[PDB]
PDB file of C-alpha atoms in Angstrom:
ATOM      1  CA  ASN A  56     -19.613 -55.232-183.717  1.00  0.00           C
ATOM      2  CA  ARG A  57     -20.558 -58.814-184.441  1.00  0.00           C
ATOM      3  CA  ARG A  58     -21.767 -60.706-187.487  1.00  0.00           C
ATOM      4  CA  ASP A  59     -22.967 -64.222-188.143  1.00  0.00           C
ATOM      5  CA  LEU A  60     -20.303 -66.735-189.102  1.00  0.00           C
ATOM      6  CA  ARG A  61     -20.437 -67.854-192.750  1.00  0.00           C
ATOM      7  CA  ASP A  62     -23.065 -65.224-193.507  1.00  0.00           C
ATOM      8  CA  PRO A  63     -22.963 -64.260-197.215  1.00  0.00           C
ATOM      9  CA  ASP A  64     -23.273 -60.614-196.095  1.00  0.00           C
ATOM     10  CA  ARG A  65     -19.576 -59.735-195.854  1.00  0.00           C
ATOM     11  CA  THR A  66     -20.142 -56.173-194.643  1.00  0.00           C
ATOM     12  CA  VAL A  67     -18.379 -54.793-191.574  1.00  0.00           C
ATOM     13  CA  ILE A  68     -19.725 -51.773-189.709  1.00  0.00           C
ATOM     14  CA  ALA A  69     -16.801 -49.407-189.267  1.00  0.00           C
ATOM     15  CA  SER A  70     -16.357 -48.049-185.756  1.00  0.00           C
ATOM     16  CA  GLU A  71     -15.763 -44.349-185.130  1.00  0.00           C
ATOM     17  CA  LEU A  72     -13.471 -42.580-182.651  1.00  0.00           C
ATOM     18  CA  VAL A  73     -14.631 -39.301-181.096  1.00  0.00           C
ATOM     19  CA  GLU A  74     -12.368 -37.310-178.774  1.00  0.00           C
ATOM     20  CA  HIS A  75     -14.081 -34.866-176.443  1.00  0.00           C
ATOM     21  CA  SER A  76     -13.002 -31.725-174.638  1.00  0.00           C
ATOM     22  CA  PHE A  77     -13.948 -29.263-171.938  1.00  0.00           C
ATOM     23  CA  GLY A  78     -12.532 -25.885-170.955  1.00  0.00           C
ATOM     24  CA  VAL A  79     -11.313 -24.724-167.548  1.00  0.00           C
ATOM     25  CA  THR A  80     -11.405 -20.946-167.133  1.00  0.00           C
ATOM     26  CA  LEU A  81      -9.902 -18.348-164.790  1.00  0.00           C
ATOM     27  CA  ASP A  82     -12.792 -16.019-164.018  1.00  0.00           C
ATOM     28  CA  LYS A  83     -12.879 -14.549-160.479  1.00  0.00           C
ATOM     29  CA  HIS A  84     -10.730 -12.139-158.466  1.00  0.00           C
ATOM     30  CA  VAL A  85     -10.804 -12.531-154.667  1.00  0.00           C
ATOM     31  CA  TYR A  86      -9.478  -9.629-152.627  1.00  0.00           C
ATOM     32  CA  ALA A  87      -9.405  -8.044-149.193  1.00  0.00           C
ATOM     33  CA  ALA A  88      -8.748  -4.308-149.080  1.00  0.00           C
ATOM     34  CA  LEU A  89      -8.109  -1.967-146.167  1.00  0.00           C
ATOM     35  CA  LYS A  90      -7.421   1.724-145.715  1.00  0.00           C
ATOM     36  CA  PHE A  91      -5.963   3.535-142.716  1.00  0.00           C
ATOM     37  CA  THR A  92      -5.587   7.248-142.192  1.00  0.00           C
ATOM     38  CA  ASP A  93      -2.196   8.577-141.149  1.00  0.00           C
ATOM     39  CA  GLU A  94      -3.592   9.239-137.670  1.00  0.00           C
ATOM     40  CA  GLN A  95      -4.719   5.621-137.351  1.00  0.00           C
ATOM     41  CA  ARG A  96      -1.371   4.324-138.612  1.00  0.00           C
ATOM     42  CA  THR A  97       0.638   6.621-136.330  1.00  0.00           C
ATOM     43  CA  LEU A  98      -1.466   6.296-133.170  1.00  0.00           C
ATOM     44  CA  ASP A  99      -4.102   3.558-133.268  1.00  0.00           C
ATOM     45  CA  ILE A 100      -2.145   0.688-134.851  1.00  0.00           C
ATOM     46  CA  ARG A 101       0.314  -0.869-132.384  1.00  0.00           C
ATOM     47  CA  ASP A 102       1.678  -3.896-134.256  1.00  0.00           C
ATOM     48  CA  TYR A 103       0.812  -4.007-137.933  1.00  0.00           C
ATOM     49  CA  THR A 104       1.057  -7.748-138.531  1.00  0.00           C
ATOM     50  CA  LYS A 105      -1.407  -9.297-136.092  1.00  0.00           C
ATOM     51  CA  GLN A 106      -3.673  -6.248-136.142  1.00  0.00           C
ATOM     52  CA  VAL A 107      -3.968  -5.780-139.923  1.00  0.00           C
ATOM     53  CA  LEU A 108      -2.323  -8.453-142.046  1.00  0.00           C
ATOM     54  CA  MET A 109      -3.411 -11.625-140.265  1.00  0.00           C
ATOM     55  CA  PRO A 110      -7.127 -10.663-140.255  1.00  0.00           C
ATOM     56  CA  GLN A 111      -6.767  -9.788-143.943  1.00  0.00           C
ATOM     57  CA  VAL A 112      -5.254 -13.168-144.823  1.00  0.00           C
ATOM     58  CA  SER A 113      -7.901 -14.955-142.769  1.00  0.00           C
ATOM     59  CA  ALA A 114     -10.584 -12.997-144.632  1.00  0.00           C
ATOM     60  CA  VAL A 115      -9.215 -14.065-148.003  1.00  0.00           C
ATOM     61  CA  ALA A 116      -8.906 -17.676-146.822  1.00  0.00           C
ATOM     62  CA  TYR A 117     -12.532 -17.794-145.684  1.00  0.00           C
ATOM     63  CA  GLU A 118     -13.687 -16.177-148.924  1.00  0.00           C
ATOM     64  CA  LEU A 119     -11.773 -18.855-150.840  1.00  0.00           C
ATOM     65  CA  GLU A 120     -13.495 -21.581-148.818  1.00  0.00           C
ATOM     66  CA  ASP A 121     -16.815 -19.918-149.664  1.00  0.00           C
ATOM     67  CA  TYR A 122     -15.806 -19.967-153.336  1.00  0.00           C
ATOM     68  CA  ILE A 123     -15.183 -23.716-153.123  1.00  0.00           C
ATOM     69  CA  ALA A 124     -18.452 -24.338-151.292  1.00  0.00           C
ATOM     70  CA  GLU A 125     -20.414 -22.442-153.942  1.00  0.00           C
ATOM     71  CA  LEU A 126     -18.674 -24.519-156.606  1.00  0.00           C
ATOM     72  CA  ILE A 127     -19.636 -27.779-154.894  1.00  0.00           C
ATOM     73  CA  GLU A 128     -23.194 -26.745-153.998  1.00  0.00           C
ATOM     74  CA  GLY A 129     -24.160 -25.108-157.288  1.00  0.00           C
ATOM     75  CA  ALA A 130     -23.038 -28.057-159.390  1.00  0.00           C
ATOM     76  CA  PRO A 131     -25.577 -29.487-161.848  1.00  0.00           C
ATOM     77  CA  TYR A 132     -27.101 -32.437-159.998  1.00  0.00           C
ATOM     78  CA  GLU A 133     -29.770 -34.189-162.047  1.00  0.00           C
ATOM     79  CA  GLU A 134     -31.488 -35.453-158.899  1.00  0.00           C
ATOM     80  CA  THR A 135     -30.983 -35.061-155.154  1.00  0.00           C
ATOM     81  CA  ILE A 136     -31.002 -38.088-152.870  1.00  0.00           C
ATOM     82  CA  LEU A 137     -33.384 -37.482-149.981  1.00  0.00           C
ATOM     83  CA  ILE A 138     -32.174 -38.645-146.578  1.00  0.00           C
ATOM     84  CA  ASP A 139     -34.961 -39.933-144.377  1.00  0.00           C
ATOM     85  CA  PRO A 140     -33.967 -38.839-140.848  1.00  0.00           C
ATOM     86  CA  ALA A 141     -35.600 -41.978-139.439  1.00  0.00           C
ATOM     87  CA  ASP A 142     -33.603 -44.235-141.813  1.00  0.00           C
ATOM     88  CA  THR A 143     -30.587 -42.368-143.174  1.00  0.00           C
ATOM     89  CA  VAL A 144     -28.343 -45.227-144.326  1.00  0.00           C
ATOM     90  CA  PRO A 145     -30.356 -46.256-147.433  1.00  0.00           C
ATOM     91  CA  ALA A 146     -29.790 -42.767-148.860  1.00  0.00           C
ATOM     92  CA  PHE A 147     -26.010 -43.117-148.642  1.00  0.00           C
ATOM     93  CA  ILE A 148     -26.169 -46.648-150.038  1.00  0.00           C
ATOM     94  CA  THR A 149     -28.167 -45.132-152.901  1.00  0.00           C
ATOM     95  CA  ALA A 150     -25.457 -42.513-153.426  1.00  0.00           C
ATOM     96  CA  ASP A 151     -22.754 -45.185-153.515  1.00  0.00           C
ATOM     97  CA  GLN A 152     -24.851 -47.182-155.987  1.00  0.00           C
ATOM     98  CA  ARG A 153     -25.363 -44.156-158.234  1.00  0.00           C
ATOM     99  CA  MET A 154     -21.625 -43.578-158.427  1.00  0.00           C
ATOM    100  CA  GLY A 155     -21.063 -47.295-158.951  1.00  0.00           C
ATOM    101  CA  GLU A 156     -23.399 -47.651-161.920  1.00  0.00           C
ATOM    102  CA  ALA A 157     -21.706 -44.591-163.447  1.00  0.00           C
ATOM    103  CA  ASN A 158     -18.376 -46.460-163.274  1.00  0.00           C
ATOM    104  CA  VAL A 159     -16.876 -43.812-160.994  1.00  0.00           C
ATOM    105  CA  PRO A 160     -13.695 -45.174-159.359  1.00  0.00           C
ATOM    106  CA  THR A 161     -14.085 -46.264-155.750  1.00  0.00           C
ATOM    107  CA  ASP A 162     -10.946 -44.474-154.537  1.00  0.00           C
ATOM    108  CA  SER A 163     -10.467 -40.752-153.881  1.00  0.00           C
ATOM    109  CA  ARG A 164     -14.130 -40.306-152.931  1.00  0.00           C
TER     110      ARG A 164
ATOM    111  CA  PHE B 274      -7.180 -14.865-159.275  1.00  0.00           C
ATOM    112  CA  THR B 275      -9.415 -17.915-159.007  1.00  0.00           C
ATOM    113  CA  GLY B 276     -11.195 -20.286-161.340  1.00  0.00           C
ATOM    114  CA  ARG B 277     -13.450 -23.241-160.729  1.00  0.00           C
ATOM    115  CA  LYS B 278     -14.976 -25.936-162.870  1.00  0.00           C
ATOM    116  CA  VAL B 279     -17.458 -28.784-162.509  1.00  0.00           C
ATOM    117  CA  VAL B 280     -16.306 -31.755-164.594  1.00  0.00           C
ATOM    118  CA  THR B 281     -19.236 -33.307-166.466  1.00  0.00           C
ATOM    119  CA  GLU B 282     -19.466 -36.228-168.859  1.00  0.00           C
ATOM    120  CA  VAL B 283     -19.035 -36.150-172.624  1.00  0.00           C
ATOM    121  CA  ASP B 284     -22.824 -36.214-173.108  1.00  0.00           C
ATOM    122  CA  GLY B 285     -23.411 -33.414-170.592  1.00  0.00           C
ATOM    123  CA  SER B 286     -24.447 -35.482-167.580  1.00  0.00           C
ATOM    124  CA  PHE B 287     -22.809 -34.972-164.185  1.00  0.00           C
ATOM    125  CA  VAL B 288     -22.108 -38.328-162.531  1.00  0.00           C
ATOM    126  CA  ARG B 289     -18.849 -37.722-160.652  1.00  0.00           C
ATOM    127  CA  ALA B 290     -20.671 -36.168-157.692  1.00  0.00           C
ATOM    128  CA  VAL B 291     -23.865 -36.850-155.761  1.00  0.00           C
ATOM    129  CA  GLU B 292     -25.943 -34.471-153.656  1.00  0.00           C
ATOM    130  CA  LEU B 293     -28.069 -35.559-150.703  1.00  0.00           C
ATOM    131  CA  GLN B 294     -30.487 -33.471-148.661  1.00  0.00           C
ATOM    132  CA  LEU B 295     -32.431 -34.118-145.474  1.00  0.00           C
ATOM    133  CA  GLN B 296     -36.184 -34.540-145.827  1.00  0.00           C
ATOM    134  CA  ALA B 297     -38.435 -32.112-143.952  1.00  0.00           C
ATOM    135  CA  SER B 298     -41.832 -33.326-142.759  1.00  0.00           C
ATOM    136  CA  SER B 299     -43.056 -30.143-141.052  1.00  0.00           C
ATOM    137  CA  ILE B 300     -42.010 -26.651-140.019  1.00  0.00           C
ATOM    138  CA  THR B 301     -42.636 -24.618-136.883  1.00  0.00           C
ATOM    139  CA  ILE B 302     -42.237 -20.956-136.005  1.00  0.00           C
ATOM    140  CA  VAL B 303     -39.753 -20.604-133.162  1.00  0.00           C
ATOM    141  CA  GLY B 304     -41.225 -18.960-130.078  1.00  0.00           C
ATOM    142  CA  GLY B 305     -44.881 -19.700-130.703  1.00  0.00           C
ATOM    143  CA  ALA B 306     -47.524 -17.044-130.180  1.00  0.00           C
ATOM    144  CA  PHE B 307     -46.067 -13.640-129.345  1.00  0.00           C
ATOM    145  CA  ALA B 308     -47.132 -10.068-128.637  1.00  0.00           C
ATOM    146  CA  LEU B 309     -45.450  -6.979-130.052  1.00  0.00           C
ATOM    147  CA  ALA B 310     -43.868  -4.561-127.593  1.00  0.00           C
ATOM    148  CA  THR B 311     -45.384  -1.530-129.350  1.00  0.00           C
ATOM    149  CA  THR B 312     -47.953  -0.947-132.072  1.00  0.00           C
ATOM    150  CA  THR B 313     -45.185  -0.192-134.589  1.00  0.00           C
ATOM    151  CA  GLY B 314     -42.734  -2.766-133.245  1.00  0.00           C
ATOM    152  CA  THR B 315     -41.033  -5.384-135.390  1.00  0.00           C
ATOM    153  CA  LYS B 316     -40.066  -8.995-134.748  1.00  0.00           C
ATOM    154  CA  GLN B 317     -37.783 -11.227-136.802  1.00  0.00           C
ATOM    155  CA  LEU B 318     -39.450 -14.622-137.196  1.00  0.00           C
ATOM    156  CA  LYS B 319     -37.377 -17.814-137.213  1.00  0.00           C
ATOM    157  CA  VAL B 320     -38.705 -21.020-138.787  1.00  0.00           C
ATOM    158  CA  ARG B 321     -37.282 -24.461-138.021  1.00  0.00           C
ATOM    159  CA  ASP B 322     -38.036 -27.750-139.738  1.00  0.00           C
ATOM    160  CA  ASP B 323     -38.612 -31.072-137.966  1.00  0.00           C
ATOM    161  CA  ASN B 324     -34.849 -31.699-137.989  1.00  0.00           C
ATOM    162  CA  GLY B 325     -34.275 -28.320-136.349  1.00  0.00           C
ATOM    163  CA  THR B 326     -32.771 -26.781-139.480  1.00  0.00           C
ATOM    164  CA  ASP B 327     -33.281 -23.039-139.881  1.00  0.00           C
ATOM    165  CA  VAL B 328     -35.403 -22.737-143.022  1.00  0.00           C
TER     166      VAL B 328
ATOM    167  CA  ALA C   2      -8.502  -1.873-175.474  1.00  0.00           C
ATOM    168  CA  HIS C   3      -5.413  -4.070-175.709  1.00  0.00           C
ATOM    169  CA  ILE C   4      -5.837  -7.215-177.805  1.00  0.00           C
ATOM    170  CA  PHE C   5      -3.514 -10.211-177.504  1.00  0.00           C
ATOM    171  CA  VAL C   6      -3.222 -13.168-179.887  1.00  0.00           C
ATOM    172  CA  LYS C   7      -2.826 -16.387-177.909  1.00  0.00           C
ATOM    173  CA  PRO C   8      -3.046 -20.134-178.563  1.00  0.00           C
ATOM    174  CA  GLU C   9      -5.728 -22.560-177.472  1.00  0.00           C
ATOM    175  CA  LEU C  10      -3.838 -24.889-175.155  1.00  0.00           C
ATOM    176  CA  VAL C  11      -5.051 -28.482-174.905  1.00  0.00           C
ATOM    177  CA  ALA C  12      -4.245 -30.524-171.820  1.00  0.00           C
ATOM    178  CA  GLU C  13      -4.776 -34.050-170.562  1.00  0.00           C
ATOM    179  CA  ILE C  14      -5.132 -34.128-166.786  1.00  0.00           C
ATOM    180  CA  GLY C  15      -6.387 -37.686-166.342  1.00  0.00           C
ATOM    181  CA  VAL C  16     -10.121 -37.264-166.929  1.00  0.00           C
ATOM    182  CA  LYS C  17     -11.110 -40.372-168.883  1.00  0.00           C
ATOM    183  CA  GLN C  18     -14.495 -41.603-170.005  1.00  0.00           C
ATOM    184  CA  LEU C  19     -15.762 -43.900-167.273  1.00  0.00           C
ATOM    185  CA  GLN C  20     -16.059 -47.558-168.260  1.00  0.00           C
ATOM    186  CA  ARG C  21     -16.993 -50.716-166.415  1.00  0.00           C
ATOM    187  CA  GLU C  22     -14.721 -53.467-165.182  1.00  0.00           C
ATOM    188  CA  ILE C  23     -14.740 -56.805-166.995  1.00  0.00           C
ATOM    189  CA  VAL C  24     -15.520 -59.815-164.798  1.00  0.00           C
ATOM    190  CA  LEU C  25     -17.779 -62.154-166.820  1.00  0.00           C
ATOM    191  CA  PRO C  26     -15.176 -63.727-169.171  1.00  0.00           C
ATOM    192  CA  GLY C  27     -13.414 -65.359-166.235  1.00  0.00           C
ATOM    193  CA  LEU C  28     -16.454 -66.940-164.582  1.00  0.00           C
ATOM    194  CA  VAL C  29     -17.683 -68.888-167.625  1.00  0.00           C
ATOM    195  CA  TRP C  30     -16.515 -72.317-168.778  1.00  0.00           C
ATOM    196  CA  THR C  31     -14.369 -71.354-171.757  1.00  0.00           C
ATOM    197  CA  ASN C  32     -13.019 -73.592-174.534  1.00  0.00           C
ATOM    198  CA  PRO C  33     -13.705 -77.178-173.448  1.00  0.00           C
ATOM    199  CA  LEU C  34     -14.032 -77.804-177.195  1.00  0.00           C
ATOM    200  CA  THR C  35     -11.739 -76.513-179.928  1.00  0.00           C
ATOM    201  CA  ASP C  36     -11.764 -78.786-182.965  1.00  0.00           C
ATOM    202  CA  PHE C  37     -14.727 -77.042-184.546  1.00  0.00           C
ATOM    203  CA  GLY C  38     -13.105 -77.074-187.926  1.00  0.00           C
ATOM    204  CA  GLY C  39     -12.534 -80.681-188.787  1.00  0.00           C
ATOM    205  CA  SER C  40     -16.029 -81.462-187.522  1.00  0.00           C
ATOM    206  CA  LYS C  41     -18.859 -81.387-190.029  1.00  0.00           C
ATOM    207  CA  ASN C  42     -21.341 -78.491-189.825  1.00  0.00           C
ATOM    208  CA  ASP C  43     -18.886 -76.714-187.482  1.00  0.00           C
ATOM    209  CA  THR C  44     -20.501 -78.749-184.701  1.00  0.00           C
ATOM    210  CA  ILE C  45     -18.917 -80.966-182.058  1.00  0.00           C
ATOM    211  CA  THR C  46     -21.197 -83.635-180.641  1.00  0.00           C
ATOM    212  CA  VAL C  47     -21.044 -83.969-176.856  1.00  0.00           C
ATOM    213  CA  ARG C  48     -22.116 -87.396-175.640  1.00  0.00           C
ATOM    214  CA  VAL C  49     -24.126 -87.668-172.424  1.00  0.00           C
ATOM    215  CA  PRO C  50     -23.638 -91.182-170.956  1.00  0.00           C
ATOM    216  CA  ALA C  51     -26.432 -93.698-170.439  1.00  0.00           C
ATOM    217  CA  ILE C  52     -28.529 -94.221-167.306  1.00  0.00           C
ATOM    218  CA  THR C  53     -30.579 -97.395-166.901  1.00  0.00           C
ATOM    219  CA  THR C  54     -33.227 -98.732-164.525  1.00  0.00           C
ATOM    220  CA  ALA C  55     -33.628-101.863-162.414  1.00  0.00           C
TER     221      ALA C  55
ATOM    222  CA  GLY D   2     -19.256 -68.253-211.076  1.00  0.00           C
ATOM    223  CA  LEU D   3     -16.724 -65.429-210.972  1.00  0.00           C
ATOM    224  CA  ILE D   4     -14.351 -64.210-208.284  1.00  0.00           C
ATOM    225  CA  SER D   5     -15.980 -60.767-208.476  1.00  0.00           C
ATOM    226  CA  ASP D   6     -19.403 -62.291-207.793  1.00  0.00           C
ATOM    227  CA  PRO D   7     -21.001 -61.789-204.360  1.00  0.00           C
ATOM    228  CA  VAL D   8     -20.354 -64.414-201.721  1.00  0.00           C
ATOM    229  CA  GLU D   9     -22.668 -67.389-202.146  1.00  0.00           C
ATOM    230  CA  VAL D  10     -24.332 -69.446-199.430  1.00  0.00           C
ATOM    231  CA  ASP D  11     -21.965 -71.781-197.602  1.00  0.00           C
ATOM    232  CA  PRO D  12     -23.149 -75.418-197.484  1.00  0.00           C
ATOM    233  CA  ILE D  13     -21.572 -75.635-194.022  1.00  0.00           C
ATOM    234  CA  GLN D  14     -23.909 -72.850-192.882  1.00  0.00           C
ATOM    235  CA  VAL D  15     -26.904 -74.655-194.406  1.00  0.00           C
ATOM    236  CA  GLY D  16     -26.042 -77.893-192.629  1.00  0.00           C
ATOM    237  CA  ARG D  17     -25.345 -76.028-189.396  1.00  0.00           C
ATOM    238  CA  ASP D  18     -28.802 -74.455-189.493  1.00  0.00           C
ATOM    239  CA  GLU D  19     -30.358 -77.805-190.442  1.00  0.00           C
ATOM    240  CA  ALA D  20     -28.827 -79.429-187.354  1.00  0.00           C
ATOM    241  CA  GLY D  21     -30.334 -76.635-185.250  1.00  0.00           C
ATOM    242  CA  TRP D  22     -27.734 -76.482-182.476  1.00  0.00           C
ATOM    243  CA  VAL D  23     -26.866 -72.787-182.873  1.00  0.00           C
ATOM    244  CA  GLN D  24     -27.885 -71.139-179.618  1.00  0.00           C
ATOM    245  CA  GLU D  25     -30.886 -68.813-179.771  1.00  0.00           C
ATOM    246  CA  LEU D  26     -31.463 -66.567-176.777  1.00  0.00           C
ATOM    247  CA  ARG D  27     -34.105 -64.252-175.393  1.00  0.00           C
ATOM    248  CA  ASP D  28     -33.786 -60.590-176.331  1.00  0.00           C
ATOM    249  CA  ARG D  29     -32.115 -59.026-173.308  1.00  0.00           C
ATOM    250  CA  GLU D  30     -33.564 -55.545-173.868  1.00  0.00           C
ATOM    251  CA  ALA D  31     -37.133 -56.687-174.591  1.00  0.00           C
ATOM    252  CA  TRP D  32     -39.908 -55.894-172.130  1.00  0.00           C
ATOM    253  CA  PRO D  33     -41.854 -57.852-170.997  1.00  0.00           C
ATOM    254  CA  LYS D  34     -39.470 -60.834-171.109  1.00  0.00           C
ATOM    255  CA  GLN D  35     -39.937 -62.891-174.251  1.00  0.00           C
ATOM    256  CA  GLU D  36     -41.002 -66.503-174.200  1.00  0.00           C
ATOM    257  CA  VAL D  37     -38.204 -69.049-174.512  1.00  0.00           C
ATOM    258  CA  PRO D  38     -37.322 -69.876-178.148  1.00  0.00           C
ATOM    259  CA  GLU D  39     -38.130 -73.294-179.574  1.00  0.00           C
ATOM    260  CA  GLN D  40     -34.505 -74.399-179.992  1.00  0.00           C
ATOM    261  CA  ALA D  41     -33.553 -73.301-176.471  1.00  0.00           C
ATOM    262  CA  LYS D  42     -35.834 -76.065-175.132  1.00  0.00           C
ATOM    263  CA  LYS D  43     -35.305 -78.834-177.700  1.00  0.00           C
ATOM    264  CA  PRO D  44     -34.411 -82.173-176.066  1.00  0.00           C
ATOM    265  CA  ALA D  45     -31.066 -83.882-176.452  1.00  0.00           C
ATOM    266  CA  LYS D  46     -30.993 -86.285-179.371  1.00  0.00           C
ATOM    267  CA  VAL D  47     -31.573 -89.935-178.506  1.00  0.00           C
ATOM    268  CA  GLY D  48     -28.444 -90.871-180.435  1.00  0.00           C
ATOM    269  CA  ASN D  49     -26.370 -88.967-182.972  1.00  0.00           C
TER     270      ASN D  49
END
């Protein structure tokens, strides 16, 4: 705060300190499940790894990437910057400006 | 087990990320005028914007 | 079903409130005058020299 | 007066306001922009 020098009002406005918080939660369970009859395991499956396990791990990896994309895309954006396909650069300059006026650091963007 | 969070500001605003989207000026139905093979036939219509995005 | 009594953990992971950089104090002519006490009315008089005409 | 009495008016402050060299400025957050204050445009004194 500020006050006039030599003002006969000798009252100081006390500042206040407020600490904030937000919670991060573990909430989803991503899985890939398979079932094979004994006939399929005995006869149809030749090598288990590249015929069963690797597709399963790839499936989980892609589902995780989908999870991340839904996180990014469903985020609460107050307004969306519209890119004019004839003049696209001003939109990205606008985006940079929006994150600059919000005092967002310029690294790790 | 997975968890995700969007980090917002202390007053509730979200300023750490920015979303941009292409503008669409018009849409068209891909394929133009068409005729059904049978009376009870079905066709899946595809619509594309002026940028060619499937909308 | 099963009920478990657990804490509420608090962490700091480096999310700070965003604040601006300070640049204006360095660009302004600061403290060419100091002896403000010891001058009446807390005022220093700056003299602008004379310009004449022919 | 008394020590417990409220702070009285400083003669230095009175003389400082009489001289009229304390900078007054336009309200930054006012719209439309305010007119320039009277002191902000007072000429330099012919002497001292």
